[PDB]
Amino acid sequence: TQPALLRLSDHLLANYKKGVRPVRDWRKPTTVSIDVIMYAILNVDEKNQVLTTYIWYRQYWTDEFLQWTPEDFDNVTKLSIPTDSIWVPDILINEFVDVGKSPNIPYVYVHHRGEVQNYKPLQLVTACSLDIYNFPFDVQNCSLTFTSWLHTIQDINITLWRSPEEVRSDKSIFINQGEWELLEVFPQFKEFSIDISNSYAEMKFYVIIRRRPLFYAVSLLLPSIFLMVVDIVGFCLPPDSGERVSFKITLLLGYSVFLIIVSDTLPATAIGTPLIGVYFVVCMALLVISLAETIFIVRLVHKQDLQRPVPDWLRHLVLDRIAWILVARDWLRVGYVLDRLLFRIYLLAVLAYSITLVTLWSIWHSS
Amino acid sequence: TQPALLRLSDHLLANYKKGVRPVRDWRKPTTVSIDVIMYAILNVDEKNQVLTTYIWYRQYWTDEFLQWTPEDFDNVTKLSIPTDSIWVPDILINEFVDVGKSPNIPYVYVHHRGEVQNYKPLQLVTACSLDIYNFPFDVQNCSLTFTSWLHTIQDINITLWRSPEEVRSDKSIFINQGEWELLEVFPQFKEFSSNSYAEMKFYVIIRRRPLFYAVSLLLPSIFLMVVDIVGFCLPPDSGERVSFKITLLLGYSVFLIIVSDTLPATAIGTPLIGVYFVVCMALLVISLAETIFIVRLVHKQDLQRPVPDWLRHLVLDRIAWILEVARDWLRVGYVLDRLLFRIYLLAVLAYSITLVTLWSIWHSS
Amino acid sequence: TQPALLRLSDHLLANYKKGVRPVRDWRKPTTVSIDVIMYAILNVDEKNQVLTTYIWYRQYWTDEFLQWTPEDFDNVTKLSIPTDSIWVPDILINEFVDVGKSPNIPYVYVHHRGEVQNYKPLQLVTACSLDIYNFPFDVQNCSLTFTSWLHTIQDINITLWRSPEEVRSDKSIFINQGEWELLEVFPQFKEFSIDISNSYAEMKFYVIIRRRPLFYAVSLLLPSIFLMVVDIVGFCLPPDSGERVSFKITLLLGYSVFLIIVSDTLPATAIGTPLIGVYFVVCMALLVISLAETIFIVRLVHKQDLQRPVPDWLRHLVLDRIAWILVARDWLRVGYVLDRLLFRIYLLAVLAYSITLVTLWSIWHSS
Amino acid sequence: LRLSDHLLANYKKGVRPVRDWRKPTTVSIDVIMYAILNVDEKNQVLTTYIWYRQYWTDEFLQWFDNTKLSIPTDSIWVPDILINEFVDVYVHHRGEVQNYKPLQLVTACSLDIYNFPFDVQNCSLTFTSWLHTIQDINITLWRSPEEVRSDKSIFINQGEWELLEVFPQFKEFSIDNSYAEMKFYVIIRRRPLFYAVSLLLPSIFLMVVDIVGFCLPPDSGERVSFKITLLLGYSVFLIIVSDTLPATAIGTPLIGVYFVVCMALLVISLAETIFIVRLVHKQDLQRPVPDWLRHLVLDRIAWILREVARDWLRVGYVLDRLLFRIYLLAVLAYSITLVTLWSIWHSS
């Protein structure tokens, strides 16, 4: 006689009709139980707002027609059935933009007295909402939403196979050496109602994804800190002596290309460029202002030029400046007090920058 | 005895066939209704002139063969039925080149009195005129049309499910803050052109956000141009300014490299501001070559002539009027350098004016 | 007559049923025999987490239902069958994160008496833990793991079809050229349990590779050596009062752009920066401190400041430490002392950099 | 429309059509080299958007409905022919069948990035029979072998790669048991203009200005400042180099050797200048030497083929002129290299 698996697959599928939701009493909902195990954050595309994540996804649902007794079929207990030959739930991720190159699992595993298991892995290209105002210390929160695309809550209800205390902190298979460290996966449930009684049934997972700053802390933050602290130090060179002008020249001449590549490598989104990114633009501004000062004072010392005009705006400006801070020689005094003002501006800017970085790190570590 | 949904699904399908329209009066059209809400614009690329989108496309119709009375079928008011078995209106999207990885739902709803709904997301790749010329401030206008593949209007009529007011204003799920703002979706509907399909066209109008490119491109550009302006006249011309000029040329070379990774190489060539990048590179190269040339003469000094006498007269009569022997070549070089500096300042002014104009047109949209 | 050739299909295909694992008794395991042959690594990318590989891959198993004899027609000994029609063990690469549009051969080839042979080009994307710290002379170790989902060890069992050492030695199809050179491939089998009281069955390979440090060496390692030498000369030979500042800031900018180059070459990683990169940070910090100290002490206090001493700390330090280990004139003298101190530690840093590069090359070549 | 149903009922999708067994069956192939897209230049893969065409007379069926049919061959058997290095990708009543499809072949090839950016590469596409093959398989080539296809192709794209000679040749192989294959060899130019303006022009300008640096007096601190700023120039230039040059098994392209040569020459030139600025009357410390090396240095002034301080100034002068001469020789060797590479690239 034919083997039990053939006779059983005949007994089950020879009159099975997929599409009909598998319940004898139609008015009873089916109940569907889902788990996601995160495996890898393959990307977080800030520009496109797409988190691409690889997960391991399992469904469990009870089907009253795939129901049979081992006693009549050589005591066989499980079977493997082609996935497209039984009903499967309508559960799609809402915030989803590409099926991805997921490896398909063509069979689903079925257990006597009517049970179904389906295990499949999804290279989700999700869609997500991302904040880069903190950078590189961003703590980012991304959501996965699972819903019956047509079936209302009277037909499909969505449930967590593991308790919420353990879907969180699962981080078991997770390849935790990527750029992004998985902090938690947190699950939340909502009966979305679209109108008076056609409430849908929806399940939510939130995936909290903290950047590991250390590479960016070395590459972006430490070079910028050194070039800023050395530029402030340059003020200690005597005002507009040959050293000062040459120093400011070469410093601008290298820092400008450093800033080109830095401003390339910072992410950007419509929400805004990173908070540290405004301080690099501020350093661009203060470099420009510095060199534009030196060209004025260099002409004063170098040429027989600015010594010939008087400073036609009131000397009131000078006593005002010194009152806040504390004719060629009058021009030189103006240059000196302007240089001291610019140094004060640099020191303020670098204090604000370091306080910002420590604030961002405190926030990131508080998470 | 029999489960209600099974005997119902059998009763529907047992006499069903896809070879006939969903209507018994074969002469009448089926009245399809359509709706679209745009979810995301994933890419626009000049390389293929294609627009890649994601849309929650919806179909609605009535099937005169799917009537049933729930009072018989155990009060089942509605059923889910596999899309392979039921007839589906063969709408073809035109201006269309791939359906992509659309996670299609295998079932459609049906109800008592046979009204049908079919929701499927589509990752449409459309094709469009990508005049990127205004980059990065470009406003683009991409037609996304729907057509009957063979049904003449007398067989299928295509309608919106809801007023253009909501189809235009229902941006409610658009995943904003990406590179492209969805400015609007505009429905328009005319004959597909005796037997013509009732074709329809929703015009996807999308506006690039410059703030992505502000720091990536615009601010480094302006910074480099101001750097060159400040550097042009600070060093004396004999003061080995060649070192500054060459190192900044390297910096403008390391910049243009970053700017070709960024700037779209569309079929018309690079966008407008690529012209001002090339102009600035050219003027910088010219200034460097001038500085190199004059340094040779000022160190050589044994040159057999103090000036290019034929040109010197015009240089004085016009260039200086608009704005041992090695000293005269130095004077000529100084006048040329002042000319080139003024040309650079004019070029940066023109670039800034065009940038503000592009912003003004983009914001007026 | 000749369409009777089609008999050899029709007699099987009308009776075959993909849903059943093709064994005489379901208590029998099903036994699957594998060869994997390797085609150039297309890239290592996302250098913190991801590997991409191209492979030529074999399955053989016995099918109890494709049983037939050549005498049924003209002694036809072998036949080709579409995989659309035959049961296939769903042996996935467990590390999958993407699967790739290889030709994906439609057909599978079967012997008389129901031996079954499957040959397919296959393209893999794989998640792996990367020794980025020893860059550039790296010897990555990457894993490929093979298991059927849902199928227990009692359903599916996996074995090499070659000898183990034959797989390790067989590189015949590997095209040799590229940034990465495959070293050795190691095959291993074990078991695991996760959602079963018994266990699954697991067969794993350990592809090894070592990127050719030719381009990375010349580009970053060589110029770096030259610049470090340029600083080794620029520390001693320029006078302490001289225009050292422009030199040191220029080489600081040098190291900053080497950090840029590495950061472009090498994306964000859990390990902060390659061992070599850490030395660029150390050199940059030494340059920053040396430039700041020289600027303040000589170029304020000697050239411009009055005869203002700070004796006790300076005198104490020189008499206790420097005099063992070795006004304005004394400021210049302690300037020279600090120069020698910074020169000695910087020379030691150059020695450490050389020792690391020779130690990195030693490890790489010995792989 | 109507006649297809009995045809697709009487013969199955998935089995090789033939009138009789043991008869080998023969397949004919055509390719248009449509739009080469991007050479990875990582000496590994060759992305292309070829257009591929197949004909075979052997679909077993022949012929209602009043001559051409086009039921898609998702319903009909298709020959096994595939590209070998194949990473990531109508019918007539006489019984002869026609299929056209476009393939985004990633391919694989042994690139020869040595003349960079004036590359010419010779690169392979192979079409081969692997399973379901038949022992006596034979493969057939449209248009006369190496005829009509060889030249005047459609040439759709030039955005980065030019493309040139496409040589068809056909071959049969036996592993013990025989396979039949067609071989297509395709030849492409890099477009050098972008790389020329973005890398070669900065490079040659650095050669020129560094040569100009030798016009400054050998003892002057102006040389120190100049050379320092040019060392910054090269430091930033290495960003250009490391971005632009692709990784390769050979290490670096031939152009990319002269970069490190000039870097080394500049670096050693700094030490010379720094020594001579040290060996100046106010700070030379009269640093003595045992004269023999000094005479063997000074006599090079003849053997080409304060007053005490002048000794070291003359040493500095001769070292300067020697280093200038070796720098000049490197500039000429570079220029001749560029002219040679350009001439080769233009002639092919």
Author numbering:
A (entry chain B), C (entry chain C): 8 to 333, 422 to 462
B (entry chain A): 8 to 200, 204 to 333, 421 to 462
D (entry chain D): 13 to 75, 80 to 82, 84 to 106, 116 to 202, 205 to 333, 420 to 462
The paper states:
We demonstrate that the pentameric ligand-gated serotonin 5-HT3A receptor (5-HT3AR) can assemble to tetrameric forms and report the structures of the tetramers in plasma membranes of cell-derived microvesicles and in membrane memetics using cryo-electron microscopy and tomography. We purified the full-length murine 5-HT3AR in a saposin lipoprotein-stabilized lipid bilayer and performed single particle cryo-EM, as we previously reported. Further classification of the tetrameric particles, without the application of symmetry, resulted in two structures: a near-C2-symmetric (which we will refer to as symmetric) and an asymmetric tetramer. The differences in the conformations were observed mostly in the extracellular domain (ECD): in the asymmetric tetramer, the ECD is organized similarly to the pentameric form of the receptor with one missing subunit, while the second conformation assembles as an apparent dimer of dimers. Both conformations showed tightly packed transmembrane domains (TMD) with a C4 symmetry between the membrane leaflets.
In the apo-dataset 60% of the particles represent an asymmetric tetramer and 40% the symmetric one while in the serotonin-bound dataset, the ratio was 53:47. The extracellular domain of the chains C and D of the asymmetric tetramer are displaced by 6–14 Å outwards from the receptor’s central axis, leaving a larger space between the extracellular domains of chains A and D. The transmembrane domains of the tetrameric conformations were less variable, with displacements of 1–4 Å. The analysis of FES suggested that the transition from a symmetric (6.4 kJ/mol) to an asymmetric tetramer (3.6 kJ/mol) is energetically possible and is likely to happen spontaneously (ΔG = −2.8 kJ/mol ≈ −0.67 kcal/mol). The reduction of the solvent-accessible area and of the gyration radius for the asymmetric state highlights that the asymmetric state is more compact than the symmetric one. From the manually picked thirty thousand particles, a subset of 4431 particles generated a density map resembling the asymmetric tetramer observed in our single-particle analysis at a resolution of 25.2 Å (H and EV4E). While few water molecules were observed close to both the intracellular and extracellular exits from the pore, the central ion pore region (corresponding to the residue L260) of both the symmetric and the asymmetric tetramers did not contain any water molecules during the whole long-time scaled MD simulations. This analysis suggests that the captured structures are not permeable to water and ions. Finally, a pentamer is formed by adding a monomer to the asymmetric tetramer.
